[PDB]
Amino acid sequence: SNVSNALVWELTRKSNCFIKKNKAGKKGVFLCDPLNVNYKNTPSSSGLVKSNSTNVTLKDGKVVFSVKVNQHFKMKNVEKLLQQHGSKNKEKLLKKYKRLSKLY
Amino acid sequence: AVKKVGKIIKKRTKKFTRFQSNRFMRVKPAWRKPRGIDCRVRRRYKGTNLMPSIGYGSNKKTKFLLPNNKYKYVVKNVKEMEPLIMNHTKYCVQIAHNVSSKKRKQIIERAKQMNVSVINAKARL
Amino acid sequence: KFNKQKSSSRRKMRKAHFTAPAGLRRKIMSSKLSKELRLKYKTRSLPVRKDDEVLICRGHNHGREGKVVKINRKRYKIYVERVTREKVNGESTFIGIHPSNVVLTKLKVDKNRKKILDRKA
Amino acid sequence: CIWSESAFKKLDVIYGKIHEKKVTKKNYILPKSIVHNPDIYRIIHSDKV
Amino acid sequence: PTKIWRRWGRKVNLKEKRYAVCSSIAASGVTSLVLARGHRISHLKEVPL
Amino acid sequence: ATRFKKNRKKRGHVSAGHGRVGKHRKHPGGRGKAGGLHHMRINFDKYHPGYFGKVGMRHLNLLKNRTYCPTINVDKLWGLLPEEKKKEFSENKDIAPVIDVTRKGYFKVLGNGKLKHNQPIVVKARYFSSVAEKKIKAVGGQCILVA
Amino acid sequence: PVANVYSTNGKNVVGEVEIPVVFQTPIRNDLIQSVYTNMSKNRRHPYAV
Amino acid sequence: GIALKNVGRIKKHGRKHLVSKNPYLRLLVKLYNFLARRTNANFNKIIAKRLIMPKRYRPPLSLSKLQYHMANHPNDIAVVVGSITDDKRLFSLKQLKVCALRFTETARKRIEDAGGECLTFDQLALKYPTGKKCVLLRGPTKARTAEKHFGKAPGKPKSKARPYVRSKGRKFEKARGRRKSRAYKK
Amino acid sequence: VAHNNVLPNVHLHKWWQHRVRVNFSKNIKKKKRRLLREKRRKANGGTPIEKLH
RNA sequence: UGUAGGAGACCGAUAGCAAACAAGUACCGUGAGGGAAAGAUGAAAUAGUACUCAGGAAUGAGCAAUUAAAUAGUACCUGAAAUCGUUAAGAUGGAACGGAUUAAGAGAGAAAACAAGUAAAGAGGGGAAUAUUCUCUUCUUUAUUAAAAGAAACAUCAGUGAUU
RNA sequence: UCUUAACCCACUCGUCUUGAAACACGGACCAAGGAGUCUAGCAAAUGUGCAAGUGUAUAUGAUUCUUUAAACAUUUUACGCAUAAUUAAUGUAAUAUGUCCAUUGUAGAUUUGUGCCCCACUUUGCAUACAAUACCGGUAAGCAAAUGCUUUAUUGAGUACGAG
RNA sequence: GAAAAAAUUUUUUUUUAGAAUCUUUUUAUGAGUAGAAAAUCGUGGGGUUUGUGUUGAAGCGAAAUACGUGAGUUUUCGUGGA
Structure with a gap:
């Protein structure tokens, strides 16, 4: 067929509306798609590139668990949901959720 | 001379000066490469306005890192701080100059919760 | 929007606003009608007249109702009864109000207006 | 992009599957x-x- | 001076234009690209809508 | 366009990227094609060999319609049929194609290449080469002169 | 290769239609971009002194 | 100091990575570079190098020429790092197996009709890892019309370079300086 | 004139700036011709306006 | 070209029509002709500087006074530089600044340039469980243990040297 | 950070010039302005689409008519350049039917095999380089009544399965 | 794909890389007018994207333990009123 992950990455490693690049601080490039586990500009992490994936975000004052077509859910409940629907990363994600959880 | 501190060596300080800016007002202070048929500076005469050149450059494993030991990131909205929770130990926020005091306060508060350093902390209060 | 007849270019419109003749100026000194009157007449907006009673609802006098003194088509200002203000030399003049900042309550009918009200109906 | 079903069917016709x-x-x-x-x-x- | 006769336009080529249209429509087809283009398309059921 | 241009790369440099010492003066050899036969003669000899003077017969109005006549070689002739038709002739010996060279807009048939041995073919055209007639005949075909 | 058709309200899904063959064309970003820059250029009104 | 040729900096020539911005072509160079780096096979390196080449260098190839090349081993697969173009001179075609960059529309139709096989490079890699039982081919390269203006300069003895002219009639560059009669000959 | 490049031949030598015209008018002129002819056909009692040749 | 429309990936007051202003005006030339400069208070002057005091007068000051704002006062937006004033600090034997390196002053600063947590008890904020239990927190305070970090000093290596 | 110091060093920049710190020239100061462009035609480079074709011209057609002065569309030999050359020219014009085969070499990439991987044989023989032959237009020369002939010379910006 | 440290065997703290014009590492090397190139950086406007504004924008003045080899970028306080 005409489209697959490598092609998507070539298409979106430059042009990409959720790339945000740090002009003032020359080191920084982030990729802020809502399915990025870590905010790296990498097809390791890219929510565009990844075939099916799991991420915790924050939307309108509530932390959201999303899974990739596309679901949404509202610590133990998150842990159970990840254990279920998910597929190193889980462990990282749980850690990310704890850190995220602190915000209000 | 060399300005060592801990893991951070920067080789050169005293920001390079456009030749002749000492003794004519019109000549701007920020750098310019002299061209000139013969002029001292291009020709590298002893003890006169030593030309910058790339080899002076900071080490490549510490290239932009503030004495904070964290990379500076400019922020004008709380949404933009959504990535930097995952790098709180290695990037530090600066709140953008334009940002009004009500919003600015909110950004400071979010950062504190998120456990990330805020460099221009006391601004506009 | 869609018609090509009327220019929408900013400069030209602005010029039109400032160089407007007196009849046109009289037309664009129009005011929102109060709810009871709006219900009565089935009409959104009217050109203002002298003996009518307005309520102010924008600017530093938004508690104030009152009768209209003079309307100034040269300066785009209506003047109202007790929006008085003393000047530097201790002389009382009326504060200018722009028509958008007033909502018109009681309006005095006369045959020219009666014709307009019927025409609207 | 929001397509009508008629539009969608017509698209296929245009580029020549069952030409006209x-x-x-x-x-x-x-x-x-x-x-x-x-x-x-x-x-x-x-x-x- | 700037004259009235700059080379204002360009004669873009028919076959290329057609290809650009086909390819652009095809690109719209792919979910990741629309999302990438920045639409808030998260809760949409299917990208060929 | 403008942002890529060469002058911006050299922008502060005195010559504008065009030589300090001799400088770029106006019209530096004299205009256009002037230096031919004299000071730019070597260029004219070395880059446009035959250029000067006149040669041959004059012709007062060419009137180019008279002498118009596109060519095709025999090599391409079977190619003016579609594929399926060609196969059908290869299969069936008894019939052969006529080809009217006028309909495809050619006037003279020339002799490059090899025709398929023992497919006769009838060729209708305005002009033929000597070679072409011999080749067409060799495979058992006929040439028909036609306006 | 079937795509779903929807009703006026999104709380239904109606009849499935085959995906048009157009959507299988190569994506070709560079073509779209380059063609767009040339094409867009033709829109302009002229200016001088 | 020290004295070295170009002060000890080596100078390689030609391309360094592809100029093309085309995503598919970018994907193909990544793939073949990977095959090149991992395997020791010369096939992978040459395919990678040729794949990078600019537009003039990889030519279009005629079917007829390809048949002539494949003739003495018709069991096997021709790979051609260019586009393949069709021919009306070619009467018929004996079911070849061809990998090419691009197919002219008519050629693909003919090859398919003949019972042959049209491979893209991704497909070639997948089916054949080292170019096993393959034949690398490329078309006429110098034969491009531009190159006929190159070489030992036009009007310098014997040399066969084309001049440049407005038109090729009898009043344009065919008198003084190209024959015995009018000054020196060619 | 320099090296391999063909001989120059541009006939803009007699005054040419006073003689350019740039047609920005193509589509609008085409629209105008169409609209007049269509109007004429509409006017003419439903008759064709084309003549036999 | 004249006049009327409509426009813009055009210019933005030293630009763009010479000309955004009372511009073919002022002004210059015997004359043919030549031919400028000069836009911006404020929301509102139907807010344009009342009043007192010192002044012949200009003006100034005010305990007085319009304004949200007059160091926005009709030279009225913003208000750079050249240049020049006031005070303070320093320098000062026929040039002045400068470069490379330190010094003594004088300013600035804590974001790496010490102390996580724990408890006591104030002030806040949230999240969950099925209006009140649980749990996460930020600011304050009291006191109360971490720890790390850099710089020193000596010692051990390793590398490169010098020495007897 | 700034500030003076102090040791040591340090000639007016631009500039044309064999050679400028010059008893060479231009620079009192400051602010803003201020100089390799645009079109035409041509070229190579490189990118991009298509490929013996290619470009849809002018123009037509559209429920195309804020944008749109753009976009879209074009019933089964219009024109440009290409596809064949050559000669002043009437003009003539590419191996050759023994065969859908595709002129000969020498090196030469890629492949097959032997005795999954280096070899050394073999095997196929691209690109290209260097030649060689054929053949086409012009010219010689020989013959000559003919669709002019010839084993021979030459010449061409020629050809030997296209490339634009 | 787990390394270490801290507490009091069990809790806490740090990090946990896969961007191909990219990452790790190695070695060599570094003069420059006339000249050529590449990589950057900045100004007016445009499409596209996601933002700052009257709890004060742009501008400006003075700076700053600010970042950059550098053009520059960033920011503090003061002015400023869109």
């Missing part, structure tokens, strides 16, 4: 791809390779 006298663009074909399948990692993963 005036709707179809005459003598025109879809450009064939340089790469047949772009899953580079599957090719690399694949047993023979």
Whole structure:
């Protein structure tokens, strides 16, 4: 067929509306798609590139668990949901959720 | 001379000066490469306005890192701080100059919760 | 929007606003009608007249109702009864109000207006 | 993009599956791809390779 | 001075234009690209809508 | 366009990227094609060999319609049929194609290449080469001169 | 290769339609971009002194 | 100091990575570079190098020429790092197996009709890992019309370079300086 | 004139700036011709306006 | 070209029509002709500087006074530089600044340039469980243990040297 | 950070010039302005689409008519350049029917095999380089009544399965 | 794919890389007018994207333990009123 992950990455490693690049601080490039586990500009992490994936975000004052077509859910409940629907990363994600959880 | 501190060596300080800016007002202070048929500076005469050149450059494993030991990131909205929770130990926020005091306060508060350093902390209060 | 007849270019419109003749100026000194009157007449907006009673609802006098003194088509200002203000030399003049900042309550009918009200109906 | 079902069906007609006298663009074909399948990692993963 | 006769336009080529249209429509087809283009398309059921 | 241009790369440099010492003066050899036969003669000899003077017969109005006549070689002739038709002739010996060279807009048939041995073919055209007639005949075909 | 058709309200899904063959064309970002820059250029009104 | 040729900096020539911005072509160079780096096979390196080449260098190839090349081993697969173009001189075609970058529309139709096989490079890699039982081919390269203006300069003895002219009639560059009669000959 | 490049031949030598015209008018002129002819056909009692040749 | 429309990936007051202003005006030339400069208070002057005091007068000051704002006062937006004033600090034997390196002053600063947590008890905020239990927190305070970090000093290596 | 110091060093920049710190020239100061462009035609480079074709011209057609002065569309030999050359020219014009085969070499990439990987044989023989032959237009020369002939010379910006 | 440290065997703290014009590492090397190139950086406007504004924008003045080899970028306080 005409489209697959490598092609998507070539298409979106430059042009990409959720790339945000740090002009003032020359080191920084982030990729802020809502399915990025870590905010790296990498097809390791890219929510565009990844075939099916799991991420915790924050939307309108509530932390959201999303899974990739596309679901949404509202610590133990998150842990159970990840254990279920998910597929190193889980462990990282749980850690990310704890850190995220602190915000209000 | 060399300005060592801990893991951070920067080789050169005293920001390079456009030749002749000492003794004519019109000549701007920020750098310019002299061209000139013969002029001292291009020709590298002893003890006169030593030309910058790339080899002076900071080490490549510490290239932009503030004495904070964290990379500076400019922020004008709380949404933009959504990535930097995952790098709180290695990037530090600066709140953008334009940002009004009500919003600015909110950004400071979010950062504190998120456990990330805020460099221009006391601004506009 | 869609018609090509009327220019929408900013400069030209602005010029039109400032160089407007007196009849046109009289037309664009129009005011929102109060709810009871709006219900009565089935009409959104009217050109203002002298003996009518307005309520102010924008600017530093938004508690104030009152009768209209003079309307100034040269300066785009209506003047109202007790929006008085003393000047530097201790002389009382009326504060200018722009028509958008007033909502018109009681309006005095006369045959020219009666014709307009019927025409609207 | 928001398509009508009529539009969607007509799209296929236009580029010549079940062609027509005036709707179809005459003598025109879809450009064939340089790469047949772009899953580079599957090719690399694949047993023979 | 700037004259009235700059080379204002360009004669873009028919076959290329057609290909650009086909490819652009095809690109719209792919979910990741629309999302990438920045639409808030998260809760949409299917990208060929 | 403008942003890529060469002058911006050299922008502060005195010559504008055009030589300090001799400088770029106006019209530096004299205009256009002037230096031919004299000071730019070597260029004219070395890059446009045959250029000067006149040669041959004059012709007062060419009137180019008279002498118009596109060519095709015999090599391409079977190619003016579609594929399926060609196969059908290859299969069936008893019939052969006529080809009217006028309909495809050619006037003279020339002799490059090899025809398929023992397919006769009838060729209708305005002009033929000597070679072409011999080749067409060799495979058992006929040439028909036609306006 | 079927795509779902929806009703006026999104709380239904109606009849499935085959995906048009147009959507299988190569994506070709560079073509779209380059063609767009040339095409867009033709829109301009002229200016001088 | 020290004295070295170009002060000890080596100078390689030609391309360094592809100029093309085309995503599919970018994907193909990544793939073949990977095959090149991992395997020791010369096939992978040459395919990678040729794939990078600019537009003039990889030519279009005629079917007829390809048949002539494949003739003495018709069991096997021709790979051609260019586009293949069709021919009306070619009467018929004996079911070849061809990998090419691009197919002219008519050629693909003919090859398919003949019972042959049209391969893209991704497909070639997948089916054949080292170019096993393959034949690398490329078309006429110098034969491009531009190159006929190159070489030892036009009007310098014997040399066969084309001049450049407005038109090729009898009043344009065909008198003084190209024959015995009017000054020196060619 | 310099090296391999063909001989120059541009006939803009007699005054040419006073003689350019740039047609920005193509589509609008085409629209105008169409609209007049259509109007004429509409006017003419439903008759064709084309003549036999 | 004249006049009327409509426009813009055009210019933005030293630009763009010479000309956004009372511009073919002022002004110059015997004359043919030549031919400028000069836009911006404020929301509102139907807010344009009342009043007192010192002044012949200009003006100034005010305990007085319009304004959200007059160091927005009709030279009225913003208000750079050249240049020049006031005070303070320093320098000062026929040039002045400068470069490379330190010094003594004088300013600035804590974001790496010490102390996580724990408890006591104030002030806040949230999240969950099925209006009140649980749990996460930020600011304050009291006191109360971490720890790390850099710089020193000596010692051990390793590398490169010098020495007897 | 700034500030003076102090040791040591340090000639007016631009500039044309064999050679400028010059008893060479231009620079009192400051602010803003201020100089390799645009079109035409041509070229190579490189990118991009299509490929013996290619470009849809002018123009037509559209429920195309804010944008749109753009976009879209074009019933089964219009024109440009290409596809064949050559000669002043009437003009003539590419191996050759023994065969859908595709002129000969020498190196030469890629492939097959032997005795999954280096070899050394073999095997196929691209690109290209260097030649060689044929053949086409012009010219010689020989013959000559003819669809002019010839084993021989030459010449061409020629050809030997296209490339634009 | 777990390394270490801290507490009091069990809790806490740090990190946990796969961007191909890219990452790790190695070695060599570094003069420059006339000249050529590449990589950057900045100004007016445009499409596209996602933002700052009256709890004060742009501008400006003075700076700053600010970042950059550098053009520059960033920011503090003061002015400023869109």
